[PDB]
């Protein structure tokens, strides 16, 4: 008689018992859903004779977990520290996340799992490779070293290193690949024909030992004057002495290294092996000049056939050097 209606549904709460109508004298209890609280706690109400439920002061509000916006040496992604939500973590470079990467604020107003910490990445003292020595290494964290620190070895004399010489601290707390130092010796160098070779005094020549070369008065070197033991047991290079050329004409203007020179004065003491010049030849049809090349190879140089060196006396004839380019 003059029943009460179904109670109002209010945010984040439950009503018990939930019926569609109530007799006067029946009781209902409002509770905030788990994870929410409210000033004054529950509300109980009794359906009165009027059939009208009283006013409901229920204030259902999500719990809040402790402030968690500051992760020393790292970064929290968050919207709000309220009951439904989760937050996630990362760390600045040189640091790792010691703990879980995300946390959740639970019904009990607690973070689970517990908030993490960023710790500095460190690598243990590095092992020294066989036949090596630490040239530079200073640990920045007691006996250990921090991220991106480096150390480098050098081998002992007569030993050749394979792979980069420095190692650095990875983000995973280990070091990069280590060098290998082996012993390497090469054979003796060959003395060159018409030349000499000098190298130090000992039964066996090892890595980065240096031998130097020379040539007699009419010959010059084919390669570098100095050579050394490479890491693979042979030599930098193995040069020979080749024969210079006599200048093949009496008077002619040629291109040596992009500039016109007079071959008789530029090579007054001979053309060296490998010296290349370009002679001037006359296209008759087009009344002009063009150039063909000639190179001194082991005492032999071959002037192009088209070339005609005019007599000193015959002044009328004009050298291809003086005729306009084609
Ligand atoms: C220095 O540490 C690196 C860290 O990677 C790993 O993480 C450690 C914490 C440990 O848990 C273990 O997983 C490794 O040590 C080493 O990295 C190597 O290189 C790859 C990339 O990091 C990787 O490998 C995987 O993938 C490749 C092909 O893509 C596969 O060939 C291999 O089977 C793996 O699935 C892996 O991280 C690791 N692999 C190997 C073979 O080492 C790194 O080796 C190490 N350096 C030294 C000198 O110790
Ligand atoms: C010095 O020796 C290296 C090593 O190559 C050699 O080749 C083997 C067949 C044998 O001769 C061994 O003594 C060495 O293993 C030479 O490096 C080589 O260079 C060319 C380039 O392609 C070729 O022969 C090989 O690919 C290279 N070697 C390897 C192992 O791949 C080098 O040229 C030699 N000479 C000098 C002056 O360094
Ligand atoms: C770091 O190394 C030292 C030796 O230099 C040694 O006493 C110990 O292993 C480390 N330091 C301390 C205080 O234990
Ligand atoms: C490898 O060695 C070279 C020459 O020693 C050096 O410049 C380079 O930095 C090394 N590699 C890396 C990744 O540092």
UniProtKB/Swiss-Prot annotation:
SUPFAM superfamilies: Complement control module/SCR domain. One of its GO terms (biological process) is negative regulation of endothelial cell migration. It comes from the Eukaryota. This is Beta-2-glycoprotein 1. Keywords: Disulfide bond, Glycoprotein, Heparin-binding, Repeat, Secreted, Signal, Sushi. Residues 244-326 are annotated as: Sushi-like. Disulfide bonds join 4-47, 32-60, 65-105, 91-118, 123-169, 155-181, 186-229, 215-241, 245-296, 281-306, 288-326. One of its GO terms (cellular component) is very-low-density lipoprotein particle. GO terms for molecular function: heparin binding; identical protein binding; lipase binding; lipid binding; lipoprotein lipase activator activity; phospholipid binding. Residues 2-62, 63-120, 121-183, 184-243 form the Sushi domain. The keyword Signal applies. SMART domains: CCP (SM00032). Glycans are attached at residues 14, 130, 143, 164, 174, 234. Binds to various kinds of negatively charged substances such as heparin, phospholipids, and dextran sulfate. May prevent activation of the intrinsic blood coagulation cascade by binding to phospholipids on the surface of damaged cells. It holds the Pfam family Sushi. N- and O-glycosylated. PubMed:6587378 also reports glycosylation on 'Asn-188' for their allele.
